[PDB]
Amino acid sequence: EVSQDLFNQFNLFAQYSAAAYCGKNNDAPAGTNITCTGNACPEVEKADATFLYSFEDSGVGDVTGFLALDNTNKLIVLSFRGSRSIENWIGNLNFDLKEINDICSGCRGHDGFTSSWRSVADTLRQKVEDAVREHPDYRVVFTGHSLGGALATVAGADLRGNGYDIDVFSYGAPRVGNRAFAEFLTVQTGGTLYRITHTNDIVPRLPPREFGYSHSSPEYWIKSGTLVPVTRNDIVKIEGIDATGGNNQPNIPDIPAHLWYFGLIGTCL
Amino acid sequence: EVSQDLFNQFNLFAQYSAAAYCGKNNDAPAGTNITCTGNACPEVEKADATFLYSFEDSGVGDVTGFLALDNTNKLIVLSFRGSRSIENWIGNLNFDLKEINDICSGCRGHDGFTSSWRSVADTLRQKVEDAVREHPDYRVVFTGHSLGGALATVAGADLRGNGYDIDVFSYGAPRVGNRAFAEFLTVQTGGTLYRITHTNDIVPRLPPREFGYSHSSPEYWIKSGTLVPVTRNDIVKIEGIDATGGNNQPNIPDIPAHLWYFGLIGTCL
Ligand SMILES: *[C@@H]1O[C@H](CO)[C@@H](O)[C@H](O)[C@H]1NC(C)=O
Ligand SMILES: *[C@@H]1O[C@H](CO)[C@@H](O)[C@H](O)[C@H]1NC(C)=O
Ligand SMILES: O=Cc1ccc([N+](=O)[O-])cc1
Ligand SMILES: O=Cc1ccc([N+](=O)[O-])cc1
Ligand SMILES: CCOC(=O)CC(C)=O
Ligand SMILES: CCOC(=O)CC(C)=O
Cα–Cα distance, B259 to B18 (Å, whole number)? 10
User: Looking at beta carbons, which residues of chain B come within 8 Å of A256?
Assistant: 37-39, 269
Percentages helix, strand, coil for chain B (3-state, rounded to 5) are 30, 25, 45
Degrees to nearest 5, angle at CA A153 with A148 and A157: 150
Please report, to the nearest 10 degrees, the dihedral formed by the alpha carbons of residues B129, B134, B136, B141 taken in order.
Answer: -50
**Cα-to-chain-centroid distance, residue B192:** 12
Interior angle at CA A224, CA A221 and CA A225, nearest 5: 115
Q: Between A37, A226, A228, which is nearest B269 by CB? A: A226
Burial class (CB in 10 A: 0-12, 13-18, 19+), B237: middle
Query: Taking the mean position of all CA atoms in its chain, how far away is CA B62?
Result: 16
Length of chain B: 269
Q: Which amino acid is at A126?
A: Q
Interacting residues of B130 by C-beta distance below 8 A, sequence separation 6+? none
Q: How far is the centre of ligand 1, averaged over its atoms, from the C-alpha of A33 (Å)? A: 6
Which residue range forms the structural domain that includes residue A221? 1-269
Torsion region of B47: left, alpha or beta (phi above 0 gives left; psi -120 to 50 gives alpha)? beta
User: What would the 3-class secondary structure string for B42-84 be?
Assistant: HHHHHCCEEEEEEEEEECCCCEEEEEEEECCCCEEEEEECCCC
| Greatest extent of chain A over all pairs of C-alpha atoms, in Å | 48
* 3-state DSSP assignment of residue A186: helix
Q: What is the CA(A41)–ligand 3 centre distance, in A?
A: 6
How far is residue A142's CA from residue A234's CA, in Å, rounded to a whole number?
24
What single string gives the DSSP state of each residue in B169-193?
EEESPPP-B-HHHHHHHHH--SS-E
CB B109 within 8 A of CB B97: yes
Q: Which of B226, B228, B263 sits opposite A227 (nearest CB)?
A: B263
The span from the CA of A91 to the CA of A68, in Å, is: 32
Phi/psi-derived region of residue B163, left when phi > 0, alpha when psi is between -120 and 50, beta in every other case: left
Q: What's the CA angle centered on B63, arms B57 and B69, to 5 degrees?
A: 100
Resolution value, angstrom units:
2.3
Q: Residue A165's CB: how many other CB atoms inside 10 A?
A: 13
Long-range Cβ contact pairs of B50-53 (< 8 A, separation 24 or more) = B51/B25, B52/B76, B52/B127, B52/B131, B53/B124, B53/B127
Strand partners, A69: A50, A76
> Which amino acid is present at B17?
S
Residue B122 near residue B187 (C-beta atoms within 8 A): no
* A38-A41-A47-A48 Cα dihedral, nearest 10 degrees: -70
- Per the CB < 8 Å rule, is B226 touching A39? yes
Nearest to B38 among A229, A256, A263 (CB): A256
Residue A253, SS3? Answer: coil
DSSP for residue B32: P
Asked if B57 and B119 count as a contact pair (C-beta separation under 8 A), the reply is no
Residue among A61, A65, A18 nearest A43 (CA): A18
Under 8 Å between Cβ of B204 and B196: no
The residues near B110 (Cβ < 8 Å, ≥ 6 apart) are: B95, B96, B97, B98, B150, B174, B175, B176, B177, B207, B213
Task: Give the span between the Cα atoms of B92 and B90, in whole angstroms.
Answer: 6
Q: What is the DSSP letter of B206?
A: -
* Tally of domains in chain A: 1
> Rounded to whole angstroms, how far apart are CA atoms A39 and A106?
44
Could you tell me the CATH number of the domain that includes residue B217?
A: 3.40.50.1820
Among protein residues, the one with the nearest Cα to ligand 3's atom 11 is A263
Q: Which of B17, B54, B79, B146 is catalytic?
A: B146
d(CA B83, CA B102): 26
Q: Which of A209, A267, A223 is nearest to B227 (CA)?
A: A267
Residue A185: exposed, middle, or buried by beta-carbon count in 10 A (0-12, 13-18, 19+)? buried
> Which method was it determined by?
X-ray
Q: Which helix (H) or strand (E) holds B238?
A: strand B235-238
CA distance A39 to chain B (A): 6
Note if A258 is an active site residue: yes
B38 contacts A227? CB cut-off 8 A: yes
Nearest ligand 2 atom to the CA of B72 is: 5
> Which H or E element spans position A213?
strand A213-214
Element holding B219 (H helix, E strand): strand B219-222
Q: CA nearest A221: which of A185, A149, A172, A184?
A: A172
Bridge partners, A67 (sequence order):
A53, A78
Measure Cα distances from B224 to A27, A47, B230, B261 in Å.
32, 21, 6, 10
